[PDB]
Amino acid sequence: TPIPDVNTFLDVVLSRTQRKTPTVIRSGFKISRIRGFYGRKVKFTQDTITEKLDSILQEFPKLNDIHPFHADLLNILYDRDHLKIALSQLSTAKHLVENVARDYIRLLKYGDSLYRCKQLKRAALGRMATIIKRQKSSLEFLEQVRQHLSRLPAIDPNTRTLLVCGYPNVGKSSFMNKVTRAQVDVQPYAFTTKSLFVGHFDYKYLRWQVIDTPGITIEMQSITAMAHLRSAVLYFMDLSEMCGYSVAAQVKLYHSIKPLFANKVTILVLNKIKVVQTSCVQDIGVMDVRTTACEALLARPACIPDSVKTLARDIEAANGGAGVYNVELRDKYILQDPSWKYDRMPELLDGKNVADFVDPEIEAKLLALDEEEERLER
């Protein structure tokens, strides 16, 4: 759910309380009636605050309950310890508000006069407002967390994936952008891909998730994702050194990152030309590298007609469109006479189903029957 501002949330809570509960209580009624009216308003105020806090708690996830790749990325990119502290502070504030409301309700249960109830009603609202106002920075952190979480993708380490990591702008992102329909923007500035980009792909009737990694906070996020992921390394080394990093530097970086690359298939991509040479400048070998990485990760004869060996929707749409087009079954008939096809037929005459008692042989049978009837009469 969206995270509102502290002032806005209080106004929305206050407005919702006033709009739903009645606000006309004449002083001439019973003390219990006045006590009940004040208590209901307080109870509604407590419920509205409780619902907002519970919704925030439900929306906020648990870092431990998250997947190892998701939790590590969340901790690196969102300071999970700070997020956990803020959530606990909100939970403590919600519990404190509930205790204050219960104390106020108990005090209201022994109400005496309308002024006492009115002062009590204001006192409860002011205490809640001060608690809400105090919990101001938590809302800002939650809103930032929600925006970061919404922008974050859904990691699926269970499925087959291909992780592309190495020197920045070594063409790995370009290869990933070519392999998968996902297109991540690339700029001449280093570390342009601040966050990982995941692109679904199909190969050999299998789904492969091409996930890019930052070149080497972004580097830490890339390392953490590669630490816990069922994917194959796609270390791309610039053979022509057009990526700004020397071949020895890329090799040293690959050797250093090999602890994370362990228990996975490692591919050595010779950029700008498993050791696979892929000409980044010429865009050659990208498909072959992807195929190699995917492979590394892994008496009733048929009477076929001559026409088979060698539209209705458009027709209906052109004439009247769907729901306004009536298809005539007369046209789709094999009747010899076109006039006969477009004409009606006699269904039942004189209480007899003529269509069920008419046969092709009746053309000659009727003449024979007529001759037989005349002979019988004679």
Partner: protein, 334 residues
């Protein structure tokens, strides 16, 4: 409770349906009629193909209850003139025909036979003496008036009814200039207008009549107007081939075996209406072209009847015609 709008629930002040709303005039259109008044006789059920586009029941067979309303051709007997005024429509003058049908004379008299039949006698002579006066009045109608209605009456003689009083009413003549309407009314004096003039076997008509009476607030006998209620067929009973559905042939007449319940045998032009109509049997009903202009598919689709049922409505009848009945039943002593 029921609808607040239909309040009060008092009995209708009119025995026969009155058309309060009429289609808007259009001089661009040709002169044409707008309302009809026949007699409800009874109802049957018919079998019909359902050619509803896009529906699940498209291009197949459906059963629909129908009502039978006999509509003998009326006799145009006069015209009236109406002037649009700051107080509404005002009747300017009224001109009639010479030889009024004798049923119409029954309408003007509560005790016809006892009366000396003096209705319109001096009007008849003054027309034969000097038609100039009538021409002057028709000049007044064609010049000053803005809405023209013709006086038409049901011709009850050929109907199988005990009643002998003609139901007189007015039909708007929409189309053409005012002089065009008067000339059309003049040329249609004393003649008959058939039902086929106004309705064309598929049109959008509004049936009006006074509902039946359940007895005592009051329950029954109010004025009503049903909308929609498409026509299925405008038969011509004068033709012996009136019903005669093309699919079934099966030479027959619309009249159910033994005659319509409490009505008799229908012989004349009749109209087939889907669903039901306000008012019980043998009651005069009023039809009018639909006021609004809607091209909904349920109002624009064509209808070609498959088979109509002419069984014995009296009791659990099971025979269409004696021609198809006799050979099925064993030859009885009679």
């Amino acid at each position: 409770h029921g609808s607040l709008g239909f309040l009060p629930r008092k009995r209708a002040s009119r025995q026969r349906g009155k058309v309060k709303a009429f289609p808007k005039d259009d001089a661009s259109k040709p002169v044409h009629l707008t309302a009809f008044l026949g007699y409800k006789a009874g109802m049957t059920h018919i079998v019909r193909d359902l050619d509803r586009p896009g529906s699940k029941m498209h291009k197949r067979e459906i059963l629909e209850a129908v009502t039978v309303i006999e509509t003998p051709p009326m006799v145009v007997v006069g015209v009236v003139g109406y002037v649009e005024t700051p107080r509404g429509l005002r009747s300017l003058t009224t001109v009639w025909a010479e030889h009024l049908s004798e049923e119409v004379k029954r309408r003007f008299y509560k005790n016809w036979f006892k009366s000396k039949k003096k209705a319109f006698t001096k009007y008849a002579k003054k027309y034969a003496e000097s038609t100039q006066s009538i021409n002057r009045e028709l000049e007044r109608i064609k010049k000053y008036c803005s809405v023209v209605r013709v006086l038409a009456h049901t011709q009850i003689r050929k109907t199988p009814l005990a009643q002998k009083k003609a139901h007189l009413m007015e039909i708007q003549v929409n189309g053409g200039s005012v002089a065009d309407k008067v000339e059309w009314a003049r040329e249609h004096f004393e003649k008959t207008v058939d039902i086929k003039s106004t309705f064309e076997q598929n049109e959008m008509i509004d049936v009006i009549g006074v509902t039946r009476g359940k007895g005592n607030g009051n329950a029954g006998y109010m004025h009503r107007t049903q909308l929609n209620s498409k026509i299925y067929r405008i038969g011509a009973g004068d033709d012996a081939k009136n019903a005669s559905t093309d699919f079934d042939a099966t030479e027959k007449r619309i009249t159910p075996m033994g005659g319509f319940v409490r009505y008799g045998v229908v012989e004349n032009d009749f109209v087939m209406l889907n669903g039901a109509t306000p008012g019980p049997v043998k009651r005069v009903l009023t039809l009018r072209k639909s006021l609004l202009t809607h091209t909904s598919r349920k109002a624009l689709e064509p209808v070609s009847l498959k088979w109509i049922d002419t069984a014995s409505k009296f009791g659990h009848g099971r025979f269409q015609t004696p021609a198809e009945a006799k050979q099925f039943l064993g030859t009885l002593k009679k």
